Amino acid sequence: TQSPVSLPVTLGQPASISCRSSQGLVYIDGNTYLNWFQQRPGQSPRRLIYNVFTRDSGVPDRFSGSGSGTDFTLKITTVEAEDVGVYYCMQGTHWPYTFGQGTKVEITVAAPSVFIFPPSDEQLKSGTASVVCLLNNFYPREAKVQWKVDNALQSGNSQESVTEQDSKDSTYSLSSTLTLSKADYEKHKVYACEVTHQGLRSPVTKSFNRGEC
Amino acid sequence: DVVMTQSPVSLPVTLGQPASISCRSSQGLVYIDGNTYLNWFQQRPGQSPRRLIYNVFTRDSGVPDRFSGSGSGTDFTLKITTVEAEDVGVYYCMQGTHWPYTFGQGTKVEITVAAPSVFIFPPSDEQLKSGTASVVCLLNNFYPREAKVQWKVDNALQSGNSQESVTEQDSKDSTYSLSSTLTLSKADYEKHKVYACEVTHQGLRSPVTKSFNRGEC
Amino acid sequence: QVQLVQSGAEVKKPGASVKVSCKASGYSFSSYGISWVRQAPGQGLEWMGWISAYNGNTNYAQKLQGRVTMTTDTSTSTAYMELRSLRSDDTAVFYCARDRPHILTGFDFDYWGQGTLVTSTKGPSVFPLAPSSKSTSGGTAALGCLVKDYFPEPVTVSWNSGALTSGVHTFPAVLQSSGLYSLSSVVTVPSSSLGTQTYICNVNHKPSNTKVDKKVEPKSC
Amino acid sequence: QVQLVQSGAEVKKPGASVKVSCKASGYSFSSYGISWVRQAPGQGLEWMGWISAYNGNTNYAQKLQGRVTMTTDTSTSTAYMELRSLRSDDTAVFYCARDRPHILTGFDFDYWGQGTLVTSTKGPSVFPLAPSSKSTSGGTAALGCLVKDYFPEPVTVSWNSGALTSGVHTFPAVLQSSGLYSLSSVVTVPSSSLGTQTYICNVNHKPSNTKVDKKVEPKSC
Amino acid sequence: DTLCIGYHANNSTDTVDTVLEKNVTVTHSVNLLEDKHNGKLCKLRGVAPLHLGKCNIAGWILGNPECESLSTASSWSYIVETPSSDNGTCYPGDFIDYEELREQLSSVSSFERFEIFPKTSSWPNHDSNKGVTAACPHAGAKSFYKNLIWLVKKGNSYPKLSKSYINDKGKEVLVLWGIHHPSTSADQQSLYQNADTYVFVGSSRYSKKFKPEIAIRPKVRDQEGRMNYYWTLVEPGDKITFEATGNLVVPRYAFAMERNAGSGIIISDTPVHDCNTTCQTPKGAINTSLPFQNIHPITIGKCPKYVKSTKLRLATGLRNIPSIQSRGGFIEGGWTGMVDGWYGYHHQNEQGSGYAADLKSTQNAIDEITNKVNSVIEKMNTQDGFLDIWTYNAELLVLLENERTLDYHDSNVKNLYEKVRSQLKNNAKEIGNGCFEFYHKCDNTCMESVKNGTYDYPKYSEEAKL
Amino acid sequence: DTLCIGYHANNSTDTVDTVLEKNVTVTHSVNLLEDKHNGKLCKLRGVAPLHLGKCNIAGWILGNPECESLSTASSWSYIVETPSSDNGTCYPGDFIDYEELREQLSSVSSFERFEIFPKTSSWPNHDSNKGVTAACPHAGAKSFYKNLIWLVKKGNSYPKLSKSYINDKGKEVLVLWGIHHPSTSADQQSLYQNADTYVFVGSSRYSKKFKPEIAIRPKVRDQEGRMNYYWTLVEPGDKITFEATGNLVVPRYAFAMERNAGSGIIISDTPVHDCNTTCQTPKGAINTSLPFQNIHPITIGKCPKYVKSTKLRLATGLRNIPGLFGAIAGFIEGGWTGMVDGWYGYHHQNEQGSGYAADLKSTQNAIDEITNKVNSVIEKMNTQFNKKVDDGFLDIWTYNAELLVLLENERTLDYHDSNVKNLYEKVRSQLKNNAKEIGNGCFEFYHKCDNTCMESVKNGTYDYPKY
Ligand SMILES: *[C@@H]1O[C@H](CO)[C@@H](O[C@@H]2O[C@H](CO)[C@@H](O[C@@H]3O[C@H](CO)[C@@H](O)[C@H](O)[C@@H]3O)[C@H](O)[C@H]2NC(C)=O)[C@H](O)[C@H]1NC(C)=O
């Protein structure tokens, strides 16, 4: 049993996760709890603290797992930006190993720099137009992106995608993509994405005119 | 060896009221399934001791229910409700499982005022025909035991030439009996006329004297 | 340099079986000790089975005991995995890692695998996202690739064949109403270097064995 | 009925050995253990040894272990005891009683012996203690025997061969400067019966096998 | 000729528990728990107990009309109460210092009830007859405690009260009184005229001022107001004093007594008998031969320590395996014929056959076993939390010492076989059933040489065969 | 061809105690008593407080001239004292409520000393400079507690004192004062003029009137009269008041502080380091799977429960040899070092080859039962645990735990002894006449049995086709 399932934290200050079991597993000669691994987005998990306390080779001393009997914790002094991803508890003694829900780790205000990219000519030669808006390296994650075509609000024809919190600078990056047919794209001139974010004194708009760099 | 410590060594009691003796050991007695102690014994004067309460509590066959031995582990007692006159003699503790029995000091039980009736017996003629004269004074069935017997020959106090002997307390009437014997040579016996024993005892308003004149019944 | 390798991503319809391999390669290989674990998005992780070529008798998960099967080879130093029936909730990324050859002595995942992601194919159309307006920004330019209409995921995208990594953001793939996936990958660069620095994005969609290298150049109007 | 009997009193000088027997009469002889105990006047009691007819193995007292020895016979159903050296403080009254069959079972002294008093010989001169006076007293007369100058103890004295016991007092023996013992035995009787009732005292000194029956008659002056 | 070794067998049905096995039958064993019973509530010491029927202690000492009037034995060693004896304090309220009073009255040597304040004379300025109530009925009419008097105002006035008594009886006197707490102010006025009243009971050993509270209670036992009951002990010479202006239930009969130390109360339905037994339990009595008992936590007198266990029996002998009924480790079956000792031999030759025990091994075992059993009883001398843990500590120790006992026997037998095996190496082979097949003929005196421990073999084995 | 059975063997030197035997070597075991030793301690970083050194707590809080003045760290969770702490109360007397104060100052989060009553201003009608004595020397001269002021009469008069302070610091303030008890009436007059004096220290949380006693105590530290030391905690907003007509040692410096819960005092000569380790013995691992230790009866912080035992080690495996049922130490008189897979296993021998193999059905069932039993013991410990209950339970629980470990160790080795006897009976019941018993835990195969035939015996399905 893991807790909490969602763990919001910030840089500088430490953190802690809690795992509890049904039986006070030991094994013979104190294998006890299996160690904990950090799985970054789109990456395999790596070893950290095997045999409860023994640290893994090639891992900073910031991490430190401690515990005795059927509850356990894992403390990390000073959270860096790279310390982000999903964490899980490791089944012990049993072969019905059973892992946690795991806890998703997530990390000063930073305003997004906004960029808009018109459809590449290559694409327009196949009947579909994709306009892209890029919000790069902002914090916190809360951000709002509206599309405007000839100043009219759009609805449905846009998809968004966000990266996990950066491993170095603790920022989020976000992409919004306006997918239109080539038909509709030829009917309107002004394409724009309006961005709002806590770090913006005013809403920002990046726009362009069709066929007009 | 087990140290069978008795207490008290001298036990003075009276009739009607009960009594109790105490025995303690160095090591506890069990001996497999509660075999325990052997018992306690009552040894009358000039007689063999008889069984009483074997296996601590189990009473002996042919013994009244007045006796009752109780205890658990080391110590403590053997109680007797209402003491009769026949309940007199020496008592001792049981063996200590391990072969060294080691018995007690066997404490001595002893029990209204009764004045002695006094009798004096002159030397029998048979004896005087062998050069020795024995005068005897008998104090019969008195209580308490404290009694004083003086011999007087022609009214002079005697010293050394008398021996005494007392019976144990009677098993029926709780009285003591005492004998004093004045042993003289036939020479001295012919020199003096008046032979007397003076008796004093709490039950006597005055000292009693029984006397006789030699050769004169 | 000690790491294991396994088979790439695959795709099978509900009903057909699937096989996955996990080679040991370099270097310090216990003769014995290999385990398998799955991870579906939205759930967590659960043990599947274990095997040793000692050969200690293998162990399976009671829930999947009927279907799973374990095999291994000492010469090639490779472990294989097999499943019988498939379904919608059976999709997950299967990982493989080493275990104690003895099994009774202890347990440890010193080195982990890559992750065989198993779920028709279709290569992506890669469109340049080219720097726009004026100097993008005076001190910073943005550019990228639009990797559109591919299936099934997943897809790789590096920049200048690994040379460029600092400042790169590759966004999570997104499913479209068409049933095809879409993905964007951007990077920030000095706006002054645009005229002198070539930027190439390298898109690999292994399900269709497709390689596309798209040069993203500015808008010299 | 199952009373046991043993040898009579004896006497031996320091240096010579002595033997004592203890027959089992009235038995009921399931062959079970026999024991021996001593009792000296002025002291108490101490175990000497033990012997069994079921078990040939015997047990002795460590202090007197060297000198003592135990033997028994099944046919005659009798147990024997013997000592080597003698001394003044080793002299005591020896008793014999049953104990136990097996070593593992409990102990019990259900039946006891008579008491062999072992400790230099004579018969006593028995002199009448006659009651005349003024007939002793109106309601009660006293008379007895003076059992003088015997050695060694012990001496018996009954009256009219057991017929007369009520009112009898037999006093403890007393040692004299001569080295010989002296004893008195008296009885009270109705002073009216003196002229019609014969009174005899029966003195038995077994060490000299001596029997004296002395008639005590009054003083018809 | 054949010589064999074996252990003792017996018809005992005693079972002991060990570390590995449980309910193991053994030849000899000592119990550590006496709960043997069917005893009937008897009497500790010659002194019999005071039996409360239809009442409790409070109703008896106060004198509830429903209780049986003296009567009342002069002396009692303990008091027995009934669980269905719930009619005590007829008028509602609570008995102050009830637990203390219960322990005081437990054991008594002399007890006498006397009229400390006669109803007719002691109260001339107050009405004593009106002190009755419906809560205390006797014969279908209002009555009150026989030992107390409920003083009411005499007409239109309640004068100040001041009565005293000097204990001239030569022994501590138990005095009891009550303080009334009415329902409403109207009842307070109707009973004692005055409104703001007070009560004071002074003595050398005791002093307290009671201010009665006038309040409406839930109304139980048909009375809305309550009444608290107090008591004290007046030493011989001390003077008790009753100063009060209302709300005082003065005493009528006090109790001159000479209490005894210790003792307690038994609450059970068992009857009384005359067997004169010396420990007692809540329901019956026991023989207290054992140092532990499991009947009830409450005990009177010198009884064994209470321990809540299913069974405690320390093992002394070996496992009993007779194996002979119906038609008929290394050695199977026990030697029922052998009774000499725990361990023994069995010879077989032309002269005869018989069993015999080795006393050197047997006596050394008896001395060590007896010594170990006494060492455990020396451990019990350690005089709700400790009870449960000591019980488990004792259970563990009995189980542990039982395994050490049976293994000590198992080792003593193996040492006896190795003693014979090492003497005759080639003169006799091992059967495997704890027996030895004598190749050369060995007579009775030759068999004794093996028992003595002095065997030589200058003769040939004769095992040439074949 | 031959098939044999045996136990596991290894190079382990772990010894356990059983019911019958002691110091028995076993293959696998879990310990139940940890003794590493203090590196230094060195715990939670800074955290040891102002190492007291030559002074004690009383001298430090009062400000004995021999102690080092602040200085003094801002925060500490526990305090360390030395047995050689000669310097406490320089002036004789006794510290009232000393044990209480020790537990209050044990753990602190914020600590600041401030001048509650400045010597120069607060006392205009009394002489504060004369408050020195020979009992408190500093540099070969009479001195006094740095945090207190001993007020003396100003000439021929000692006016009534009345000073107060309101706690505006926003956190409980520790105030300390003293009451002097002179030797003779002449000294009482020479110090405070008045004869029948009194002192009163009032507050919302505390109130007491002190009447000083004038008596000749036996001489100590060159002072016949003594001095009792008192203290209290003023909550933020409460007002302390000092009403007195003599014999009052007013405070100079109070301590505004914010206490923490728990903790205690350590009296030892060990020195200090910095290593960020919690209460459990170095190197802060601590990291003590066992709930038992044998270091000190009481230890400070979140530590395991103390048990004074020579050794406690619960057995899991079997006897290591590189019985009751007859197997261990019986027919099979040796263990298998070559076999490493499992506790119990077979050993085949045929023309194809030879090798060891363990029976996982018996081994896994044993591991599951042993692990379950080991966890059941750690559960029975932690789940269920003034001098006759604090120290009394310790000696009895230690004996109860010793007995239980001894008991459970014998049940473990017999469970292995039985599992092997069951494995041999499983093979024996299969081949009644096809192979005889060697007597060394082996079987002489009369008929031919290849690797696939040997596996049929391991599977538990044996056929009877041939002589
Ligand atoms: C301690 O001694 C024995 C230990 O087994 C217990 O007596 C036995 O108890 C069992 C039941 O637990 C009885 O078994 C029954 O046997 C009949 C046939 O006789 C069968 O039809 C039933 O299905 C059942 O198996 C057994 O008869 C009985 N007696 C013997 C001689 O084995 C005894 O109860 C134990 N006592 C305690 C206090 O633990």
TrEMBL record, chain E:
MF-aspect GO terms: host cell surface receptor binding; metal ion binding
Topology of the protein relative to the lipid bilayer: Single-pass type I membrane protein
GO cellular component: host cell plasma membrane; membrane; viral envelope; virion membrane
Keyword Translocase: no
Compartment(s) where it occurs, according to its Swiss-Prot or TrEMBL record: Host apical cell membrane; Virion membrane
Chief place where the protein resides: host cell
Binding locations of Mg(2+) 2: 273
Highest rank taxon of the organism: Viruses
InterPro entries per the UniProt record, alphabetical: Capsid_hemagglutn, Hemagglutn_HA1_a/b_dom_sf, Hemagglutn_influenz_A, Hemagglutn_influenz_A/B
Residues annotated as binding Mg(2+) 1: 8, 28
Quaternary context: Homotrimer of disulfide-linked HA1-HA2. Interacts with human CACNA1C.
Protein name: Hemagglutinin
Native species: Influenza A virus (strain swl A/California/04/2009 H1N1)
Lineage: Viruses, Riboviria, Orthornavirae, Negarnaviricota, Polyploviricotina
Gene that encodes it: HA
